[PDB]
Amino acid sequence: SETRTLQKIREATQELLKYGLLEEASKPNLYRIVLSHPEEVTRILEPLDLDIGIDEIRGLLYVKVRLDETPAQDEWAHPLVRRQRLNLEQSLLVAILRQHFVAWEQESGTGASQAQIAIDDLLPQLQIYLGDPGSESKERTRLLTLLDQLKGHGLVTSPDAHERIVIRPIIAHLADPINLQALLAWLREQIAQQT
Amino acid sequence: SETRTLQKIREATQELLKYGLLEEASKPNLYRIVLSHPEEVTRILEPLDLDIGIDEIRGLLYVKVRLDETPAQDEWAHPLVRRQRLNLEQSLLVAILRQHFVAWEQESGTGASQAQIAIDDLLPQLQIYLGDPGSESKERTRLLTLLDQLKGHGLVTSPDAHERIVIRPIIAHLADPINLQALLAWLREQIAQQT
Amino acid sequence: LNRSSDDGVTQLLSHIEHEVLVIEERLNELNETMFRVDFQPDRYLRLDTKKVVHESLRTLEKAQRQLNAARFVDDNGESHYKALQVLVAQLRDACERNRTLGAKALLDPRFRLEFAVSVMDRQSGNVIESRTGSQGGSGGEKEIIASYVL
Amino acid sequence: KVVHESLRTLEKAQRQLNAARFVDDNGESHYKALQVLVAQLRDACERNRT
Amino acid sequence: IPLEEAIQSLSSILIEHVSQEQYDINQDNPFLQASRELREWIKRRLIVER
Amino acid sequence: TLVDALMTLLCANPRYNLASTGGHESDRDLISYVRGVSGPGDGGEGQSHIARPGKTVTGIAATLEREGKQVRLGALLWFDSTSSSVTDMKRLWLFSDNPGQTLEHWLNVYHEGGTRLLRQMEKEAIGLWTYPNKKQYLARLRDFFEVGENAFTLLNRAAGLKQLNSIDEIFRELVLDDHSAFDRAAEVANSFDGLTEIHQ
Amino acid sequence: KRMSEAKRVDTGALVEAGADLDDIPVYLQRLQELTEEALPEKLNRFLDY
Amino acid sequence: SQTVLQARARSERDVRGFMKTGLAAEHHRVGHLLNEFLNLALKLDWQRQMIRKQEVPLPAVGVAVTGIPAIERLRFKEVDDEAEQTLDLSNHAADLTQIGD
């Protein structure tokens, strides 16, 4: 009877709200459609105070709070977007992944296909800040659960059949990347001072 | 160029989406706003395949999945439904609660808001079906776990100081004749299979 | 279709790469001219450059690689022609929308690399500051960035 | 002194409402005129940075 | 017997029988084993806690 | 930097480094002044450009004197971790008219104890006020200096702003106090909600 | 079919009613109620306001 | 004796409270279907966890949408430092004027 939003756009919007992002790498049909109808998606999200920011270089779309332009409130608060503070280990892992991603981009260029990194490569680096919990069976399990937790936020893919992961584009758009650098360097200096 | 939905409507619809339902007993200032502009709220929720459900007789509002121009599928298969499908043992308690609700509503009238029940009144009810573990603590824990799982669905509040709960009016819409008939049809087929 | 070939696109991409390399080579002379001067008491300015691989170019490369594979699956060549059509669509679309930066980062050499100024240490040769613009700075410290890079 | 188009339109709506009170129907005209006026104020509040 | 009091007495009694390997009595923790024993009794319907 | 030290105390949302930009943009933030960020950094893993990376404290005060009476504004800002985000900075805005109160004394008290010690000191000492958030402190400043809230914004944007590109814009946004009747319009529009509900 | 649409448009007064031939009296009584009492009272209140 | 009598009184009060319910709802429409369903439930084997963890075909009402995963919402761990304090507030008398010609 009455007009209904195009099925593909509805699917794209629901997906974008569910997962928080789209990528041309793994969802081309929806990603291209969204870019071909930006005014429709932005109109659909505006009533909820949500709005898509698009990163054409890396082929990514991600939701972000559309609240007022620097109102009397110096920090935004949104009913639906529940804020989180990653625990210490998650913060360290995110910092390591972020610096790996930036270092790779420095060479291959912005938006270059990320090189697959093996699980074995990260444990020595987490050891630099967490020591040895007691066994390989423990540290590897911890690293795997941490990677699975991060995949929920969309920062990393699942370990493939050969135990290598790929860093997702969304890592570049974290809220305050300066925090990762500061904490990581501070803990590194702590261990270097205690040793 | 830029056209924004009224700030009151945005706040009310965001709260409605957050909690899944909205009542005049607890949040009158938002319930009146939503009920005064149902067309705007319906068109805001249409892109997400969600629709409003109004009950002025009980001062209730709740969002429900849509099927128009996307028939069949499954209501719980919708991407944005964040909670698991209803479970049989939960449905038994839902039926008991609905029975108490119809009794109370038919004796008080629909206007009153205190559709309460005492916790001790449900334990004998469940003893007939789920069996008797011979330990008041175990069965009380079972009953409270079920009530919590229902609170996740929004059909009941948590026990108060006097070990009394309030059956939210949404139950009247969850178990109404159209759905009870389908549940009975499914259950008869299950029993026939058991034979 | 047998007589057809994919040389058309690969030559174009090679030409664009050659143009980008020419631009970088030309900047390499300006860097050496910069080296002879002092931007600060013992710092000398340098112009750096990263490469930008827009999603458009990655998609084009993916389509080309799929075209290479589709030639060896026989359905009266239908799949090969479909792949060729999908590939040609990207070129044509970029051609019509040449004013959007998306096609610029594919066909325009100037948009294939991003620029940023860097202050080098005269003694050690390390980087002290990476400066994609002139934000921050005092003024005078901002004006010197502006005048040097201009 | 400068009077922007918005105030002129609101004045026009004021006069229109004033005239529409007398039409003999069950509010389908008076109420419409009242709401087309109140909509101007609602819009003004909503986009108070325009 | 109040349940918490029962656990104490049952654990103290169980501590005496640790030498009877004929029934595989272990030594890790008497309190937790007493709690498990009371649960086993309750479900087997020898005792009912109310 | 010295000028912005004062502008932070005086204004509500100061425009740092306004003069260098010419008047149409500010390109620094209070976080970067507290940390003493010396630039964009080397663009990589380095952290030599930041001066106070760990736990740190910062203080600023200004003394105004008329006929011997001293009124000493002040502010304390500190971090408890490497975090350099606005939510993790903890503040305390101080207003005073006691000659004995000075920045050194406040810093000594802080080094002796956190916010609680200063809150107790507020009770202990006469002629002192503290406010955990800036709005109340600025309200105190207004009711002391008998000016509208726009006066100090005018002062801050007059620190630079050499252009005066559109007199209308200046006088509408920076001089004449806000007296818009938006609240009244919202109240009037709400008067008809009773009608709208019944019609619905 | 049409009772199922009356259910869709309804606003809580027909929650205790199915869409089978058994429930037709409920719908008819609701229609009579609207025609007789509720609608004129609501219109009088609205026209007063 | 007192314990047994109290138990009897509690049970009798509980059953009397139950009997009134159902009496006031036997011929209400939804009450009729609820009684029908509750009768059917007895046949099922509630001891089997698999049986009492089936999924019924009840609709989805009150569907809450929340926790949209906006990447901005993440904040990183605030590891605290407690080693020492920066007490130094010397006058900085090294400020004596020595500036280029």
Ligand code: BEF
């Ligand atoms: F006042 Be600064 F030198 F721009």
